[PDB]
Amino acid sequence: SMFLLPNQQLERCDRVMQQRVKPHIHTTLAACTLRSFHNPGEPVPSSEFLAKVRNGQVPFEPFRVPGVWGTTWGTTWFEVNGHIDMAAVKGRKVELMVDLGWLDHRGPGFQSEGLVYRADGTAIKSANPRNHWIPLVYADGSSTVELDEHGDFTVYIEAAANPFVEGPTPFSPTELGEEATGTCDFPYTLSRMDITIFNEDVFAYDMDLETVSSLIRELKDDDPRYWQLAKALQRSLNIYDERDLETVPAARAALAGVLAEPAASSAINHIAIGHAHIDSAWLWPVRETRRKVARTVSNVLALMDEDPDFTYAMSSAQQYAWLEEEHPDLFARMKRRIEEGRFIPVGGMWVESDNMIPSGESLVRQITFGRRYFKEHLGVTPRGIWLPDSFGYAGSWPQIARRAGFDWFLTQKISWNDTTKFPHHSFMWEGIDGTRILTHFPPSDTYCSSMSMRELMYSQRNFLDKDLSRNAILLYGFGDGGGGPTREMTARIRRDHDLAGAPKIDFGTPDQLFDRVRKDIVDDARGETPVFHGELYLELHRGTLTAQQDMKRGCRQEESMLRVVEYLCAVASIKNPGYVYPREELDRIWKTLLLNQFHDILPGSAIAWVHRQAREEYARDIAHLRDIAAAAGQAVKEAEPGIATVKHAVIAPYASNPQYSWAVRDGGVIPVSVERGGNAIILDNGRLRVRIEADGTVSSLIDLALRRELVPSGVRMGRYELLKDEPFHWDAWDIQRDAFLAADTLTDAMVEHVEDMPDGSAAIHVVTRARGVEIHTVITLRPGSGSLDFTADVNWHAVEKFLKVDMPVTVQAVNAQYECQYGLVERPINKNTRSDDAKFESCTHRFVRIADADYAAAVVNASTYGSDVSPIHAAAAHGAGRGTMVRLSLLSAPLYPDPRTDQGEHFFAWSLVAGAGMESVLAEASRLNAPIMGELPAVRPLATLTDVAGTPVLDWVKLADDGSGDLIVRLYEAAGGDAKATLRLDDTFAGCTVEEVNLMEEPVLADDLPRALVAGGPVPAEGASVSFTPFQIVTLRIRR
């Protein structure tokens, strides 16, 4: 008798799997012949190539069993001929064991892959780094491939060689993702490929050993389960012998004595969901995500064919449309499997997009497009949002989600914070207005899990809401851009149904889990329901808001373009008959603008391919939209001759005059005076007095209307700072606290000739130079206004830098007001605690307002999405150096995803408004972010708001998507106070009915929603009264 050492038994067992039991799962029987045909170019669709092969027009060269085949961003076709023989493998599974030669320590899904197509044209499966078996002949007679007379077959592997973008050191600059160079850079070497037979008992014994060994490692030394498991493992390992495989049944039974004990009746009832997050474009072009999603679907269907009691999920209906268009058989099989109820399509959004940057109109467009696609192509209605990978969440999401019909929310990226931990993992997220939506987080904090037992109990240990929930979700499946569930995790789930010492986990669906959560934390607590009010702010990255500024600028421009063109098209359709609505081209501009708003595209993190195709699509869409708007305007003028003509045709959603809101006013008393005295230039427009210093800086912006000076006398306005940022993890995504310490204040500039504009405006030109940066900045003081305009042209050429501009204002408060998609948000200025410090960079939309009891100052933006607010208490006398500073982030210079980022000329614009009222701020922001047209006919506003009591605003006007010709108006509130208004149409919209509808445009409404009408029935559309609750969103439909 000898003592027991569990730490030694663990290593013995680990060696046992590494050397002994793993190779004995597949037994080779023969070898297959290989031939190859190469293509270092843009891939040909698989449907045509297989037909060409079937007819026969492509040669094939002999390929030796070993050798290299890879090419940078290239494709290859391997024709494979086998010689499997029946009458000796009856009742036993037969596989292929394809090995393209994947690397070990690189990643499962970032290497060369490939499907195994049949001769006819259908797809069988895919060869993944961690899933490399193709089902040829099933045990029960059935064969996926068709066998010939004397036992031989053929298949075609469509190998795609995707080089690893990352270089030798982590996050290193590599010139790989730029083009399709036909040179040997990272060639893959082929490996073993032979026909094998599958052993079931050996695999079961290996899985049991793995489960036992993994359970032993994580347990403590003061639990009898630990010692019992160690003793059972030692007993089992002394019986298994690799020289004779008949000993497996005598060893599995001994190990199974401790694998059937029920767990304690206090564990968390986990629900396992198969999920594989295919990123639409991150490191590969938009032409490779189709291949990746096809591989994922083929793998999932192949695995689900043989194993019952399995579930899977897939969002991003864009991929559904691509699969339907390019793979009819795969889509048909997926739809057939959906009817059973094991391929649940979850997530009604059109594609998994970002949250903080995109406008609310884009979000609602995604929601409605995805919901319509799911409703009329798949016949399934989703119930909740599915966004398992995004950076930050706006506060307006609960309201939109609830008004869109969804009733639960699921996200996981919030757990990636740097300083603080989220209080809850299952709660009620309250919107800005009053909207509560059920929200749940995956405790494992990972959407791509290998179903390791360590992760399984880490999910239970990390569950904060352990006292009243007893329910959790767990997504399993190699993902993060490729993969899907394999046999190992679907075996682990079955082995861990009720294993003692581990949480209970079973298969299920998200709806069942969310119903369980609703029962646990809503209908049972009775007053103890967790609630989280505000917005979900990720504490990582924060540099994505000002990376690849061209993308965000173009996105804002095309959003304005769509607004104006949709209004013009609606006017054209409603004015004269016979004008067909350009529905087709409009939805072609959509689903492409919306595709380019992906969560790894819009912030900007990818190879040069994605950021080049996005730019070209933005330019093409802008040109096409301008053409469409011009055509619609010309069509309008034909309705009746000689109405009017307007130059530059500026259209704005909002304006200072309530009756001039949707006007067609053109884009172009007290002329501004300049008093050149001393070493400064002083302007006077009758309401502001600005003193530009010697070198393009403002030292005083006295408000003559109130004798108020709003420039602190410790710093100068308009100064440009070049912060040095050298991020170490996630270079493009993240900026650390290293900045704001090694600041570099540019002090090399000189003013230029002050010019009086012919219209009457006054402008001051200035040039600023740096190590490799030059800026041409013009400051404009338009007469008869209260805003100071700033425009800049930057010739960014540096590397690893960060450009910022600061606009300090003496107004002192505690919280600064940014705006969310459809409302406002409060954020602290003076950061007090540890968690408050992490919010040192937040997204901004078109303005930042700092307000006190009476006086407010705003910094209205045009094309930048990032800023930072910090208090200033400088060295001065009589308290003249106290205030706040709002530094706007212009652009950064990331290096890892793209060796060259933001090279060339960039245009920036912004303005500062004093005495910033909410209506004035909204009107001036609308003026700044408005397209400048050519010559379109002047038309009266379609809908106006005359009895404004508060701050109502028209947000969107369009037509019915159902072709009925109905008018649709979308309104919201942007201040916080309640609003009451009366809407008035024009002429032809007389004797009409207006009805409140949800964001889906269908006439069904919930009960808890505040509602805006008086009764709910059809109210005549003349003097119709609408009431607003703080930050309400209302959608109205008007008939003929």
Q: Which of residues 241-280 bind Zn ion (CB under 5 A)?
A: 279
> Of 186, 227, 458, 581, which one interacts with its own copies (CB under 8 A)?
227
Q: Tokens 């959407």 map to which residue?
A: 447
Question: Which partner, Zn ion, its own copies, none, binds residue 626 by CB below 5 to 8 Å per kind?
Answer: none
> Of 96, 216, 410, 594, which one interacts with its own copies (CB under 8 A)?
216
Pairing state between β 409-410 and 436-440: parallel
Nearer to its own copies, 534 or 1003 (CB): 534
Nearer to its own copies, 450 or 529 (CB): 529
Q: For its own copies, which stretch binds (CB under 8 A), given 151-159, 502-510, 617-625, 991-999?
A: 502-510
Answer yes or no whether residue 707 interacts with its own copies by CB under 8 A. Answer: no
Residues 775-834 that bind its own copies (CB under 8 A): 814, 830, 832-834
Residues 742-761 that bind its own copies (CB under 8 A): 742
Amino acid code (one letter) for 366:
Q
Q: How far is the CB of 954 from its own copies (least distance, A)?
A: 19
Nearer to its own copies, 694 or 872 (CB): 872
Burial 26-55 (b: 16+ CB within 10 A, else e): beeeeebebebbeeeeebeebeebbeebee
**Is residue 980 within 8 Å of residue 1025, measured between CB atoms?**
yes
Residues 862-921 that bind its own copies (CB under 8 A): 862-866, 871, 873, 876-879, 918
Q: Tokens 């003929």 map to which residue?
A: 1040
Task: Dump the DSSP string for 65-80.
Answer: SSEE---TTEEEEEEE
**Is residue 779 within 8 Å of residue 909, measured between CB atoms?**
no
Nearer to its own copies, 614 or 1024 (CB): 1024
Distance of CA 538 to the CA centre of its chain: 13
Question: Which partner, its own copies, Zn ion, none, binds residue 9 by CB below 5 to 8 Å per kind?
Answer: its own copies
> Of 172, 634, 964, 988, which one interacts with its own copies (CB under 8 A)?
172
> How many helices (DSSP H) and strands (DSSP E) are in the chain?
18, 45
Nearer to its own copies, 686 or 871 (CB): 871
**Token duo for residue 638:** 């034909």
Widest Cα–Cα separation across the chain: 109
The residue nearest Zn ion at its CB is: 389
**Is residue 868 within 8 Å of residue 840, measured between CB atoms?**
yes
**Token duo for residue 749:** 């500039």
Amino acid code (one letter) for 898:
D
Question: Which partner, its own copies, Zn ion, none, binds residue 950 by CB below 5 to 8 Å per kind?
Answer: its own copies
Question: Which partner, its own copies, Zn ion, none, binds residue 398 by CB below 5 to 8 Å per kind?
Answer: none
Answer yes or no whether residue 473 interacts with its own copies by CB under 8 A. Answer: yes
Q: How far is the CB of 210 from its own copies (least distance, A)?
A: 7
Q: Tokens 């309705």 map to which residue?
A: 639
Helix (H) or strand (E) holding 249, with range, is helix 248-255
- C-alpha span between 399 and 364 (Å, rounded): 11
Angle between helices 200-218 and 6-15 (to 10 degrees): 150
Q: Which of 61, 77, 132, 63 is nearest to 100 (CA)?
A: 132
Nearer to its own copies, 59 or 527 (CB): 527
Q: For Zn ion, which stretch binds (CB under 5 A), given 386-394, 484-492, 883-891, 925-933?
A: 386-394
Q: Mask: binding to its own copies, 935-954, rule CB under 8 A, as x and -? A: ---------------xx---
Nearer to its own copies, 30 or 705 (CB): 30
> Of 729, 769, 940, 1040, which one interacts with its own copies (CB under 8 A)?
729
Question: Which partner, Zn ion, its own copies, none, binds residue 225 by CB below 5 to 8 Å per kind?
Answer: its own copies
Question: Which partner, Zn ion, its own copies, none, binds residue 615 by CB below 5 to 8 Å per kind?
Answer: none
Q: For its own copies, which stretch binds (CB under 8 A), given 71-79, 138-146, 535-543, 883-891?
A: 535-543
Q: Mask: binding to its own copies, 511-530, rule CB under 8 A, as x and -? A: -xx-----------x-xxxx
Nearer to its own copies, 436 or 637 (CB): 436
Answer yes or no whether residue 695 interacts with Zn ion by CB under 5 A. Answer: no
Nearer to its own copies, 24 or 372 (CB): 24
Answer yes or no whether residue 269 interacts with its own copies by CB under 8 A. Answer: yes
> Of 267, 773, 805, 921, which one interacts with its own copies (CB under 8 A)?
267
Nearer to Zn ion, 210 or 279 (CB): 279
> Of 101, 129, 510, 712, which one interacts with its own copies (CB under 8 A)?
510
Residues 962-1021 that bind its own copies (CB under 8 A): 975-978, 1007-1011
Residues 829-868 that bind its own copies (CB under 8 A): 830, 832-835, 837-843, 852-855, 862-866
Bridge partners (DSSP) listed for residue 554: none
Nearer to its own copies, 539 or 898 (CB): 539
Answer yes or no whether residue 389 interacts with Zn ion by CB under 5 A. Answer: yes
**Is residue 130 within 8 Å of residue 486, measured between CB atoms?**
yes
**Is residue 427 within 8 Å of residue 458, measured between CB atoms?**
no
The DSSP letter of residue 104 is: S
Q: Which of 537, 680, 570, 618 is nearest to 939 (CA)?
A: 570
> Of 34, 94, 313, 502, which one interacts with its own copies (CB under 8 A)?
502
Q: How far is the CB of 466 from its own copies (least distance, A)?
A: 4
* Residue 739, CB-side half-sphere exposure with 13 Å CA sphere: 24
Q: Which of 567, 787, 556 is nearest to 662 (CA)?
A: 567
Residues 39-68 that bind its own copies (CB under 8 A): none
- C-alpha span between 90 and 377 (Å, rounded): 42
Answer yes or no whether residue 152 interacts with its own copies by CB under 8 A. Answer: no
Bridge partners (DSSP) listed for residue 818: 825
> Of 40, 43, 187, 508, which one interacts with its own copies (CB under 8 A)?
508
> Cα torsion at 379, 383, 386, 391 (round to 10°)?
130
- C-alpha span between 235 and 237 (Å, rounded): 6
Task: Dump the DSSP string for 152-201.
Answer: -EEEEEEEEE---SS-SSTT---S-TT----S-SS--EE-----EEE-HH
Other C-beta atoms lying within 10 Å of the C-beta of residue 638? 13
**What is the C-alpha radius of gyration for the chain, rounded to an integer number of angstroms?**
32
Question: Which partner, its own copies, Zn ion, none, binds residue 389 by CB below 5 to 8 Å per kind?
Answer: Zn ion
Q: How far is the CB of 85 from its own copies (least distance, A)?
A: 50
Q: How far is the CB of 347 from its own copies (least distance, A)?
A: 27
- C-alpha span between 602 and 798 (Å, rounded): 23
> Of 163, 274, 382, 392, which one interacts with its own copies (CB under 8 A)?
274
Q: How far is the CB of 106 from its own copies (least distance, A)?
A: 18
> Of 30, 68, 643, 932, which one interacts with its own copies (CB under 8 A)?
30
> CB-based contacts of 239: which residues, under 8 Å, 6+ apart?
247, 250, 251, 254
Size of the site for its own copies (CB under 8 A): 214
> Of 76, 199, 390, 439, which one interacts with its own copies (CB under 8 A)?
199
Q: Which of 594, 581, 393 is nearest to 965 (CA)?
A: 581
Q: Which of 875, 886, 877 is nearest to 809 (CA)?
A: 886
- C-alpha span between 116 and 96 (Å, rounded): 10
> Cα torsion at 192, 196, 202, 204 (round to 10°)?
100
Q: For its own copies, which stretch binds (CB under 8 A), given 93-101, 295-303, 320-328, 396-404?
A: 295-303
Give me the phi and psi of 17, to 5 degrees please. Answer: -65, -45
Residues 412-431 that bind its own copies (CB under 8 A): 418-420, 423, 430
> CB-based contacts of 214: which residues, under 8 Å, 6+ apart?
452, 453, 454
> Of 154, 181, 191, 234, which one interacts with its own copies (CB under 8 A)?
234
Q: For its own copies, which stretch binds (CB under 8 A), given 5-13, 679-687, 689-697, 982-990?
A: 5-13
Chain contacts with Zn ion (rule: CB under 5 A): 279, 389
